[PDB]
C-alpha cells in the first residue's frame, strides 16, 4: 500500500561555489606541465575544465559525491601534479587527487583527517579554508569557537602533521584571506566580531604561525569600524 520511490538527478546543480586554479593531470600529451586548468565544485557537484586553447573546455564530470563541499582549494607543494585540498561536511579534511585511471578520469583520495562532527554546524572548522601559497600548511577555521591548521609535508607518501589549535570562545570569524610569505612563516588575517558584546565591534586580527615553537600566535589586534567587510593580502612591497 506504501509508495516506493526512485530518485534521479537529471541535470545537476549549476551554481558554482568553488574553484581552484592548479594543473591537475597530464592528458593526451606525453610530457607537458602548464598551470592553466581549473576545477569547479558546487556542494555535491564537481567538474574539471581546461584552458590554453583560448576557450574553456570540459574534461571530466566526476562521480556523485554525496556530501556538502564547504571549501575547495588547490595546494601546490614543492617537489608533481597539483591535488585539491577539499573540506566539506562530515568534518573531514579531504585531500583529493584527480587522476587518469582505466579509460577515464577518476577522483582519488589521499588523506582525510577527522574534524568535529558530521553535519554543517557553526563549531565545525570548515567554511573558511585557505592554504599557504607555498603549500606548507592547510589552514581551516569555523565561525565562533575554534581555528585549526594542518602542517603539510610530502614524501614517498603524503603526510599531514597533527593540527594546531587556537580557541577564541566567543569570536565569530569572517573573511579568512591569508597573507603570502617568502618561507619566513605562515601568516593569516581574519575579521573577527564578538558574539557577546553590548556594542557592535568587529576587529581585524593577524596570526603568525611560528614554525620554531609549532603554535599559532596572536600578533596584532586592531579594532576597525563596525562596517568592516573583507580582507586581502598585499604580497611584498619591496
Amino acid at each position: 500500500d506504501e509508495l516506493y520511490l526512485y530518485h534521479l538527478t537529471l541535470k545537476k546543480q549549476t551554481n558554482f561555489v568553488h574553484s581552484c586554479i592548479g594543473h591537475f593531470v597530464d592528458l593526451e600529451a606525453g610530457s607537458k606541465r602548464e598551470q592553466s586548468q581549473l576545477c569547479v565544485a558546487t556542494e555535491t557537484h564537481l567538474e574539471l575544465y581546461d584552458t590554453a586553447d583560448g576557450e574553456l573546455k570540459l574534461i571530466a564530470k566526476f562521480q556523485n559525491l554525496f556530501a556538502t563541499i564547504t571549501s575547495m582549494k588547490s595546494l601546490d607543494l614543492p617537489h608533481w601534479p597539483t591535488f585539491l585540498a577539499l573540506t566539506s561536511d562530515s568534518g573531514n579534511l579531504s585531500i583529493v587527487q584527480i587522476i587518469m585511471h582505466a579509460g577515464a578520469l577518476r577522483l582519488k583520495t589521499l588523506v582525510n583527517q577527522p574534524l568535529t562532527r558530521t553535519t554543517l554546524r557553526r563549531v565545525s572548522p570548515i567554511s573558511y579554508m585557505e592554504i599557504d601559497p607555498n603549500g606548507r600548511c592547510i589552514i581551516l577555521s569555523s565561525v565562533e569557537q575554534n581555528k585549526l591548521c594542518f602542517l603539510v609535508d610530502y614524501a614517498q607518501k603524503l603526510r599531514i602533521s597533527s593540527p594546531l589549535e587556537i580557541i577564541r570562545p566567543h569570536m565569530v570569524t569572517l573573511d579568512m584571506a591569508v597573507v603570502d610569505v617568502n618561507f619566513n612563516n605562515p601568516c593569516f588575517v581574519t575579521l573577527e566580531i564578538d558574539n557577546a558584546a553590548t556594542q557592535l565591534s568587529v576587529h581585524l586580527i593577524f596570526y603568525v604561525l611560528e614554525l620554531g615553537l609549532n603554535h599559532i600566535v596572536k600578533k596584532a589586534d586592531y579594532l576597525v569600524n563596525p562596517s568592516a567587510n573583507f580582507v586581502l593580502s598585499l604580497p611584498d612591497l619591496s
Binding site: 562532527r117 553535519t119 554543517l120
Partner: protein, 138 residues
C-alpha cells in the same frame, strides 16, 4: 523482524521491576540504530511512547540504558518528531523534570545542531528578536 518483537518489548517496558525496563531499552538501541531509515517508524513511535515516562527513573544503569534508547530512537523518528515530546518540560517549574529533560536535550543537541534548526518552537512574539528572515517568501 521488528513488528513481531514490539509486543515483546511491550511487556518488558511495562513491567514493574527496573531491570526489564533497563535491558529492554538496550534492545531498542541496537534495533533503532540500524533499523532507522528502513521505513517502519510507526513501531518506533510506539516504543518511544512506552519509553518517555522512564526519563524520571533513577539508578545509574537503567538511566544510561534508557538515555541511549532515546538517542537511538531519535534517529529512527528524526530530530523533530522526537523533539515534540521534550520541548514541553524543557523549562517547567519543577527543577527536576527540568533537570531530567535538559539532559536529553543535551544529547540531542550533540547529535544534531543544524538538524534541529527548523524544529525550534519560536514565533516572532515568542522571543524578542526572533529572525526576520525566516518569514520571507519569494
Amino acid at each position: 523482524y521488528i513488528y513481531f518483537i514490539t509486543p515483546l518489548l511491550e511487556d518488558a517496558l511495562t513491567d514493574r521491576d527496573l531491570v526489564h525496563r533497563q535491558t529492554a531499552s538496550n534492545v531498542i538501541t541496537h534495533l533503532a540504530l540500524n533499523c532507522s531509515g528502513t521505513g517502519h517508524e510507526d513501531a518506533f513511535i510506539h516504543l518511544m511512547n512506552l519509553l518517555i515516562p522512564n526519563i524520571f527513573e533513577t539508578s545509574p544503569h537503567a538511566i544510561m540504558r534508557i538515555l541511549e534508547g532515546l538517542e537511538a530512537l531519535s534517529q529512527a523518528l528524526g530530530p523533530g518528531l522526537f523533539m515534540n515530546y521534550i520541548w514541553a518540560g524543557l523549562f517547567h517549574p519543577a527543577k527536576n523534570v527540568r533537570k531530567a529533560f535538559w539532559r536529553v536535550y543535551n544529547n540531542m543537541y550533540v547529535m544534531y545542531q543544524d538538524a534541529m534548526v527548523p524544529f525550534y518552537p519560536v514565533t516572532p512574539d515568542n522571543n524578542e528578536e526572533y529572525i526576520e528572515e525566516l518569514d520571507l517568501v519569494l
